[PDB]
Structure 1
Amino acid sequence: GAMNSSNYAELFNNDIKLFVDDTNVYRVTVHKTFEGNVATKAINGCIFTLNPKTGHLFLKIIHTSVWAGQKRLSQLAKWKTAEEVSALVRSLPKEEQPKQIIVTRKAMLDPLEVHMLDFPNIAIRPTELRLPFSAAMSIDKLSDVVMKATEPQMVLFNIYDDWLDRISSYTAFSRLTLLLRALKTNEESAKMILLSDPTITIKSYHLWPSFTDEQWITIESQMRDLILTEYGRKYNV
């Protein structure tokens, strides 16, 4: 059934699983028309499909041409997501296909279930975790590849960089979600923390800076402070 705090270690066992987040698939700017009406202009989007054990991120870029001439785009967006996830699974060798796909919003369950009827042995699951994957577009290199795309495209990343050389996938996911939670709660401050010291750089083949173990501990602490803070500034406490 649903995924929550009680079965949290299931994410890091040896059954292949993918998280799917659709919150950045259909993205718009809202603006005024010459006549003083309001209109939307779409911008490029992405499906965020993540193996939480390995870090492998299957970033399917959604080019704005896919919406051309279509109606009810927020509903279509869920079915387009399900179509693309299903095509991804079918592209993978059998031994790489997931045994479970966990969607971060319950509105994806029926679209994905219908698209995966050919895979009766793949469990489609919701979660009660409030995961911060919408903040993925605050990662500069991910935002950059989405905005530059001129056609549909799939780009593969490891969202953990090389962290699994030194830490477990449980600890690497906890770090990722802390980073993304911070970026979601205050992007500017989060980004300042990550890049304040110009001597720590992001390798060309990485997403995040090359922090030592001690430096990650300082960083992680700073992100917690920010999250507790903003939570005060928000609720005045």
Structure 2
Amino acid sequence: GAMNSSNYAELFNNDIKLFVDDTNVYRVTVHKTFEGNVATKAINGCIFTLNPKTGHLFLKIIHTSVWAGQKRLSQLAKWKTAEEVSALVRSLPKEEQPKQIIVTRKAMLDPLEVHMLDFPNIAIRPTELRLPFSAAMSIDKLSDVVMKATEPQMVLFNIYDDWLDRISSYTAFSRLTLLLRALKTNEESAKMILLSDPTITIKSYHLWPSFTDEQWITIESQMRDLILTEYGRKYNV
């Protein structure tokens, strides 16, 4: 059934599972035409497929060419997502194939279900959680590889860098979702916090800075404060 606050620890057990987020698959800028009409121009997108236990990210880049001469693109994007996720599963050895796939948006259930008909023992699940994975393109290295792509491409990352050497998956996922929640609610501030100190660097093979354990606590606190403030401003509380 649907994933929620109650069965939250199931994400970190030893049954392989993947989150799929399609928010950034079909991305457009909206502009005015010479005659005054409105038109869209697509930019490159990505499917965000993530193993929450291990941090393995399967970043499938969606090149604008996939849209060429197609209608009802926002609808097509869900089926393309499902096609690509199904192809990823088929590409993995049997023992790496997931037992569950959790889609962050309920509109993905039918397209993924139909594309996975060959895998009847993989459960396709929705979630009630409000996960911040749309902010993935606020991570500079992910945004950069998507925008630079000139063709379809799968790029692999560990979204937790090396954190798991020192913390558990539960805590690693909590750190990730806090960082992404902050980037989502006020990107400019969130990014200021992460770089304000020029002496803490991002390793070439990492996505996030090399904070010590103590510096991560200061960081996490700064990110919480950021999120709370935005909220009273949003609602006036």
1:161-190 residue CA offsets vs partner (Å, 9 max, x unmatched): 000000000000000000000000000000
Cα distance between partner residues in 2 of 1:98 and 1:236: 43
1:188-207 residue CA offsets vs partner (Å, 9 max, x unmatched): 00000000000000000000
Q: After the TM superposition, which parts of structure 1 deviate over 4 Å for at least 4 consecutive aligned residues? A: none
Cα distance between partner residues in 2 of 1:4 and 1:26: 27
Residue 131 of structure 1 pairs with residue 131 of structure 2: yes
What SS is found at the alignment partner of 2:40? strand
- TM-superposed deviation, 1:122: 0.1
1:98-143 residue CA offsets vs partner (Å, 9 max, x unmatched): 0000000000000000000000000000000000000000000000
Q: How does 1:186-201 map to 2 (within 5 A)?
A: 186-201=186-201
Cα distance between partner residues in 2 of 1:20 and 1:6: 20
Residue 15 of structure 1 pairs with residue 25 of structure 2: no
What SS is found at the alignment partner of 2:142? helix
- TM-superposed deviation, 1:52: 0.1
RMSD: 0.3
Cα distance between partner residues in 2 of 1:48 and 1:147: 15
Q: TM-score, normalised by structure 2?
A: 1.00
What SS is found at the alignment partner of 1:193? helix
Residue 100 of structure 1 pairs with residue 85 of structure 2: no
1:32-52 residue CA offsets vs partner (Å, 9 max, x unmatched): 000000000000000000000
Cα distance between partner residues in 1 of 2:82 and 2:74: 13
- TM-superposed deviation, 1:236: 1.7
Cα distance between partner residues in 2 of 1:108 and 1:134: 15
What SS is found at the alignment partner of 1:66? helix
Cα distance between partner residues in 2 of 1:66 and 1:41: 13
Count of residues in correspondence between the two structures: 237
- TM-superposed deviation, 1:232: 1.2
Cα distance between partner residues in 2 of 1:120 and 1:235: 45
Cα distance between partner residues in 2 of 1:223 and 1:116: 38
**Corresponding residue of 1:167:** 167
Q: How does 1:77-226 map to 2 (within 5 A)?
A: 77-226=77-226
What SS is found at the alignment partner of 1:60? strand
- TM-superposed deviation, 1:17: 0.1
1:58-90 residue CA offsets vs partner (Å, 9 max, x unmatched): 000000000000000000000000000000000
Cα distance between partner residues in 2 of 1:109 and 1:190: 32
Q: TM-score, normalised by structure 1?
A: 1.00
Cα distance between partner residues in 1 of 2:3 and 2:205: 32
- TM-superposed deviation, 1:233: 1.4
Cα distance between partner residues in 1 of 2:183 and 2:204: 21
Once the two structures are aligned, what percentage of the paired residues are identical? 100
What SS is found at the alignment partner of 1:198? coil
1:201-235 residue CA offsets vs partner (Å, 9 max, x unmatched): 00000000000000000000000000000001111
